[PDB]
Design a protein around this ligand. Structure first.
Ligand SMILES: CCCCCCCCCCCCCCCCC[C@@H](O)O[C@H](CO[C@H](O)CCCCCCCCCCCCCCC)COP(=O)(O)OCC[N+](C)(C)C
Lengths: 70, 57
């Protein structure tokens, strides 16, 4: 009666633990991958992150400058 | 990083205009009206090549 009224079968806890383990293992893998990706982008600078600004090329004046040799 | 190429002193010989600035200013307007085509050719070459060594002729 106690088991019927208050508790649940072993399979429920078993499968819930499987799901929790899957979720947290995926999270750990994603954390390692994030660290590696951050290191690579900061070292190289070829990704969307760590893009430090440079001078805009639309600021340059392309017109004769009173002197042929600029 | 490379050797600069300079024309020989023979390439720079020309019979120069030996008149003073007052003479040039007195005749400047007619000179500009008459000698427009060669002068404009040289100036266009000068701003387009951006190099004295490409504009001697
Ligand atoms: C002769 C009898 C011998 C045995 C006596 C046993 C008496 C039991 C009293 C102590 C029980 C402690 C509580 C244990 C469980 C409570 C918490 C939780 O586990 O139970 C909840 C349920 O709790 C109960 O609904 C309520 C328990 C409250 C007990 C109160 C008893 C004392 C009350 C005293 C009041 C006095 C009167 C007021 C005087 C002013 C959730 O259960 P639920 O998730 O649904 O279960 C679903 C199971 N399925 C999935 C298989 C269907």
């Amino acid at each position: 009666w106690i088991a019927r009224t208050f508790y649940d079968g072993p399979e429920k806890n078993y499968e819930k633990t499987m799901a929790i383990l899957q979720i947290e293992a995926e999270k750990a893998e994603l954390r390692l991958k994030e660290l590696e990706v951050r290191r690579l982008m900061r070292a190289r600078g070829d990704g969307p992150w760590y893009q430090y600004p440079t001078i805009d090329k639309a600021l340059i004046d392309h017109s004769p400058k009173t002197t042929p040799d600029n | 990083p490379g050797i600069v190429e300079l024309p020989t002193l023979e390439d720079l010989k020309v019979q120069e205009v030996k008149v003073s600035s007052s003479v040039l200013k007195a005749a400047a307007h007619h000179y500009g009206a008459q000698c427009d085509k060669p002068n404009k050719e040289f100036m266009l070459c000068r701003w387009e090549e951006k190099d004295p060594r490409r504009c001697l002729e």
